[PDB]
Structures are given as C-alpha cells and as structure tokens.
Structure 1
C-alpha cells in the first residue's frame, strides 16, 4: 500500500484516484473500514462492461480495493448534457452495454444491488461500465420489493434500477426522486399505480406492505418519459414491472426491438 500515491478523492468507504508508484498505472482505490470472500468471486467476474477489480489489499485494520479507473461517471455526464440532452443513439448504446454487463454477472448469480448514475463509468471509447457492486443514501433507484421488505430479492432489482436510469437519461430528470422510503414507494405508486394482487401476486403479503397505502391509478406511460418512441417505452415498461418475476431480464432485454438499430456512438467528453 506504500506502493500507492493518492492523486485525489473521487467518491464518497472512500474512493481515490491513485498512482501505483511502481507499475506507474493509475487506478481507483476504495478504502474500507467500518467475513465473506464474496469479494474473491467478484475478482474473477471480468467483463468489458464491468469496472475491473485489480487487487484486494488487506492489511492492518483497513481493506483497500484496487480498481480499474474511468474518467467520468454517468451522473456528471448527464448534467453536462442537461441542456442539449444525451442523444438517443448514445442512450441506446449505453443501455445496451449495461444490459450486457448485468446479463453477465446475473448469469453468475451476482447482483449489483445499488445501481445508480454515479456507479456507472464512461470513457472516450464510447464504453460505459458498472462500478462499485454492493454486497448483501439515495433511494431513487431502489426496486419496490426492497422498499417493501423483501429480504431475498432477485437480479430483477438491477433491471428496475437501470430502467429508472434509462428514464432519467431520456427525460433529464429523476423518474422517482424520493427522499425517504415511504416517499420513494409513494412516488412509485403515484406513477405506476398502487400495486395489488392483480398486477403483483403476493404483494399484500410483503413484510412492509400496508393495507392502508393510498390507492393511485397508473398514469399513461406517455406522460412518464416523453418524447421517447414506442420501442423505448415498451422496453422501459417491462423493466419497470412491479412483479419481479414478470420484470424483463437483462438477457431478454437485449433482444427487445428497441436495440434493433443500436450502434456505438463515441461521446464528446470534457475531461
């Protein structure tokens, strides 16, 4: 670890941009403080659309995770495109790539659990990668089953989160900017309608389900993410299904007609 030289803090454990004094390579260091080699498997989980975990340095009373370093996260890129708006071809490519990474680790029975713009990294080659996988403060992207107390949720929670992000890239506003758990759950219910046994069997048996939840109708998906086309709205619709079992999987999402004309644009980045 005396092998590394900090360059700057880039994320808040904390994450630093570091320079390996020997290899001379620049990386991202995750400093963790406050017993599972779930991490040891993550180490072998390599894919072009997943930020690579280079090393795990366990010494003293700290745990440092050395990762591949990308220059910009999707959040910063979105604000930089706020007035112009991320072009659809670029949006499509990004969606497509993330779905590739998710399909990959999901087939390995590994979930990210906390997908969000800041956990998505981009480079100048037009690539976007999943970063900072969580292990078993913003609730904006949490799927409803989690919000409802599901202890053993599936890979479908990453799809929900990605769907929210998809919606954000298109509209340039958070789909569900909740500021507390109930508020998050209620902003979700206000948009897609309160879930019931019809559209989500077993929902009322969810640990935090409350028969007293207000009952809202589902608003038209045409009001949710304009001016996205029919294909896009069809895909988002299936990524946002209440029932985790009916929610589309990453793999099947790859075959959605929306990705028929998918290309790989190269973003104009201002590093």
Structure 2
C-alpha cells in the first residue's frame, strides 16, 4: 500500500487526470511513467497524476528545504534567483560523494557579492555538532550559525515542475492545435506560439515540404525526442502529415540573440552572460556525451525561459534540411561536421554572447571571413571580455579540430570561472 503526497497544486486538464492540492495524500495504483494511476484520499477519485508532482510520505522530497537531483551549479542558480535572501538555503544530493548530501547557503561576500557556499554532510557537517535527522541539522543552523558563513533563513524558492505532456501523444492530429502568433519566419518554415487542445501553451515549428522524406525526418525526430536535458528545449509532439509541425515547450523570452539585443539583456552583467554560456556548454556536453552533433550552434538557436534558463533548440535539425561565420573551416571546406566543429561554433557563440548579440566578424563578407581564417586571423578580444574567457574562444578556434577542447572540459571551466577549485566546497573547523 503506497501512499504519496502532493508537493504542488494541480488542476486536471485531460479526460482522466485528477485535481489535487499541496498536502493531499493519495494511494498509488500503478506506476506507468510520467503519469501514475492513483486514488485521492481527499476526493476518493481514481485517475491520473503527474508522477513528479508527488513523493512518498515523510520522504525527504516532502521537505521544503530539500532538492533532489540538483547539481552544485544549478543549486547555485536557484538560490540566486529572485525571491531569495541572505541565509536562504537548501539540502541536496551531493554530486561527488554519491549517496551523500550537501547544504548550500546564500551569502554576501565582501569582494564577490551574493554567492552560494556549499558544505558536505556525512549526520554531521562538523564534529562539534552531530544530528540524526537533517531536520535536526536545519533547525540548529537556523538558530545562529555554529560556523557557517550565514545562519539559515528560509528554504530556497522552488519552481513548479512542467506539466508532463499527455500520455501516448507523441503524434497528434493537426486539429488539436491553434497557431495563434507567428513568432519567426524564414527559409524553411515558421515558428508560432500555439495552444494544444485548449489547455496547454506550446511553440510550433512549421516545416516547409523539402528534401526531405517525412519518414526520414520522423526517424530523426524520434532521436531528438530521446535527448532530454534541462538545457535542451523539450520536444512534446509532432504532426506527421506534410507540412510537418514540431511541437515544443514555449520559451517566454524567445531567442538568446533577440534577448541580448533587448533592454533587459543589455542590463545583464558579465557573470550572468558567462552563466548563460556555461548553461549552453552544459547542454553541449550532454549532446557530446550522447555522441550526437548539433551542426548549427549559434545564439539564434538558443532559447531563453522566463526565469533566464538557456535552452538549446534545433539540435540535429540541419542534418535533415548560410551561417558560415559560425562554421568551422573543415565543415566549410569538406562538409565534415563533428562535435568538434560544434566546439568551434561555441566559440563564436561565446563571442556573440559577450558582445550582446553583435554579428560575428563585423563588416566582413562571408568570403572575406573564409580567406581571413586561412591566414590565421581570429576575432580580437572585445572590451568587456576577460582575457581568460577570450582564451577559451581561441582554444575553440584551433585550426586542428582535435586540438579543440571538449564541451565537458569547457563546461567545467565556465561553470567555475569565478571559483578556485579548492573554494568549491567550504572547510569547517
């Protein structure tokens, strides 16, 4: 008899899903993936619930201060999100010491500003203070800082998870959609803000009938679908009849390119710009890990969420279909696209980010650029760009692909650009 508990409020919007409130307990009847069958103890109704909107009762995930599967760097982004304060904290699974936990606390450093420190847990952080529940631990450091950089305020502001997409609805009939606003148009099709079945806001990329084979595309989209990561735009659905529509999560702030050239983007200081590029390299290290290739990495193909999360779009799309200024020389001269020619692209994108969306090689024609690279010319370091950031770009732009670093390596550098390794975690007497 498995009882679970609602972590958030949820309105049913389908045929057989249940409505419930934060606090409602439910009897799990079946665990079918993203949707589970359950019985609400509040309504006595049997139906479907999003499996990620609940956890087992008295389990750690029930706890406001607890965050499952969150990385040191993402923990750090969540505690620096609006609505937090000094002392804002959380406890999460540790990445390095697997099966163990860590505490992350919001701080103000004299030199650095608002930061987030991290401590390990073994339960104790320190010998002079042992506890038997993490809840025990938490209240102690809420009651004055027995060592820490700050005393524990209130738990981290939590996001509400995305609704899982309707069950068995990878292929949808065109009729389920209303394409309400054209967001972008181009050579290959359009992008629209849309609504699915009157309940869900989505984006749709409408593809113009092309090369093409629908059966060859649909085979690629199945692959695209399996590439699931916080830093890739999520594919929800596809309309299989020409013209093909691709349905994805909507991204409130549109493209990174358009966002950087906006007023809100102009206010973004360098460390945030870097954070962006680190988010992207994370997404790219994933793609690299899956032995996939992007083939069109640039700011136009990064999307931005309302809460400034950067997401990779159009991955592997180009295989199925003139940005030579983002294109590695071996991709231009021989059509040899690899994860390494993506690295090259990432370099240009990095320069794009730091110059708030400015066009690469400003005032240079595509041919002018190609000849320039042949002489070994590269874009010069802009004003606001730190030397070490510029060095990463130069490494991305090695003539030899194999001398270009990995995204895994790039991610690890970008991620900790302002933190010395020894300073990633804290020491406590």
TM value normalised by structure 1: 0.77
CA contact (8 A) 1:164 1:174 kept: no
| 1:239 aligned onto 2:422 | no
User: What is the match of residue 328 of structure 2?
Assistant: 143
Q: Deviations over 1:136-180 (max 9, x none)?
A: 24332112211212x332111222122112112223433325876
Q: Deviations over 1:91-132 (max 9, x none)?
A: 111111000101101211211111222211112322101011
Matched ranges for 1:208-219 at <5 A? 218=377
**How many aligned residue pairs are there?**
231
User: What is the match of residue 100 of structure 1?
Assistant: 282
User: What is the match of residue 28 of structure 1?
Assistant: 203
Q: For residue 62 of structure 1, report the CA deviation from its aligned partner.
A: 2.2
- Counterparts of 1:82 and 1:54, CA distance in 2: 29
| 1:168 aligned onto 2:168 | no
The change in CA–CA distance for 1:75 and 1:260 in structure 2 (over 3 A counts) is: closer
| 1:2 aligned onto 2:175 | yes
User: What is the match of residue 51 of structure 2?
Assistant: none
User: What is the match of residue 195 of structure 2?
Assistant: 19
CA contact (8 A) 2:251 2:303 kept: yes
State which drifts further: 239-248 or 46-55.
Answer: 239-248
Is the radius of gyration larger for structure 1 or structure 2? Answer: 2
Q: For residue 55 of structure 1, report the CA deviation from its aligned partner.
A: 1.2
- Counterparts of 2:329 and 2:264, CA distance in 1: 28
The change in CA–CA distance for 1:104 and 1:46 in structure 2 (over 3 A counts) is: same
Runs of 4+ more than 6 Å apart: none
Q: Deviations over 1:199-232 (max 9, x none)?
A: xxxxxxxxxxxxxxxxxxx47x7x4333322321
User: What is the match of residue 154 of structure 1?
Assistant: 338
CA contact (8 A) 1:140 1:178 kept: no
CA contact (8 A) 2:204 2:245 kept: yes
Q: For residue 31 of structure 1, report the CA deviation from its aligned partner.
A: 1.4
Higher strand share: 2
Q: For residue 5 of structure 1, report the CA deviation from its aligned partner.
A: 0.5
User: What is the match of residue 66 of structure 2?
Assistant: none
CA contact (8 A) 2:275 2:414 kept: no
CA contact (8 A) 2:182 2:190 kept: yes
CA contact (8 A) 2:195 2:201 kept: yes
CA contact (8 A) 1:164 1:176 kept: no
> Which blocks of at least 5 consecutive residues in structure 2 are unaligned?
1-173, 420-429
Q: Deviations over 1:217-260 (max 9, x none)?
A: x47x7x43333223212211111222111111110112227733
CA contact (8 A) 1:29 1:64 kept: yes
Matched ranges for 1:119-134 at <5 A? 119-133=301-315, 134=317
- Counterparts of 2:250 and 2:221, CA distance in 1: 18
User: What is the match of residue 230 of structure 1?
Assistant: 387
CA contact (8 A) 2:325 2:366 kept: no
